[PDB]
Design a protein around this ligand. Structure first.
Ligand SMILES: CC#C[C@]1(O)CC[C@H]2[C@@H]3CCC4=CC(=O)CCC4=C3[C@@H](c3ccc(N(C)C)cc3)C[C@@]21C
Length: 239
């Protein structure tokens, strides 16, 4: 079996959000629903990553560090892919039952958040990215940041990232070109991967949880310790 065929088989199914359209939309209802769906997608990202060949032989500390640094990137990228594929990049397709149409986008705070995710979709559309390219690109997002002080098994990590870079290469060559166009396309796709760092930067500035949510989650002694208690190398193909 080829390596991309194995990526295809472990690719997560698309989850429903459990949003009901029988109530008028509100920003609260959508964000609340997205909170639940986002937790579920993280669980599915971990399960996917744990079956990535190479990656899965890193110590768990390395695997968990990589996931910590990349889960938002992976979810925004797959969101981008879904939106491109289901709606030709017209609409943000969080889930088959939760699509942000032109009207939901005028809801308070929707445009500002969504415009960053719609950028991913529109780039996949502009570049006409193939499914095999997408699978390899998405694995590379898992391997796109490391601790400043290095992983436990940095040498293995290097080997694994290089094998998925070469896999991306093989997906571009299959899709097509007469030499100049393979390298142009490699340039373009690796620029998109780089730009995912900036997408995630914007997306991290949004509200994770409220005070009510925080209060219900934690016992007071533990929150106290947190209060008393008051680095990352972004791997770039291009400077
Ligand atoms: C509209 C909107 C919006 C956002 O606030 C910004 C990016 C969304 C994120 C992208 C990546 C993402 C892709 C999806 O498929 C919707 C799920 C999703 C989200 C949302 C989310 C909510 C909670 C978490 N936690 C608790 C693990 C993770 C993701 C909502 C995000 C943060």
């Amino acid at each position: 079996p080829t390596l991309v065929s194995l990526l295809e088989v472990i690719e997560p199914e698309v989850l429903y959000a459990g949003y009901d359209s029988s109530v008028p939309d509100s920003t609260w209802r959508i964000m609340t629903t997205l909170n639940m769906l986002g937790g579920r997608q993280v669980i599915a990202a971990v399960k996917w990553a744990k079956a990535i060949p190479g990656f899965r032989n890193l110590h768990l500390d390395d695997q968990m560090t990589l996931l910590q640094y990349s889960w938002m990137s992976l979810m925004a990228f797959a969101l981008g892919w879904r939106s491109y594929r289901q709606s030709s990049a017209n609409l943000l397709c969080f889930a088959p039952d939760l699509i942000i149409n032109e009207q939901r986008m005028t809801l308070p705070d929707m445009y500002d958040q969504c415009k960053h995710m719609l950028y991913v979709s529109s780039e996949l559309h502009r570049l006409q990215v193939s499914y095999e390219e997408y699978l390899c690109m998405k694995t590379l997002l898992l391997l796109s940041s490391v601790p400043k002080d290095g992983l436990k098994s940095q040498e293995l990590f290097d080997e694994i990232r290089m094998t998925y870079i070469k896999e991306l290469g093989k997906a571009i060559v299959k899709r097509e070109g007469n030499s100049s166009q393979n390298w142009q396309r490699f340039y373009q796709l690796t620029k998109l991967l780089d730009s995912m760092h900036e997408v995630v930067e914007n997306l991290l500035n949004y509200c994770f949880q409220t005070f009510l949510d925080k209060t219900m989650s934690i016992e007071f002694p533990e929150m106290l310790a947190e209060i008393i208690t008051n680095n990352i190398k972004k791997l770039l193909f291009h400077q």
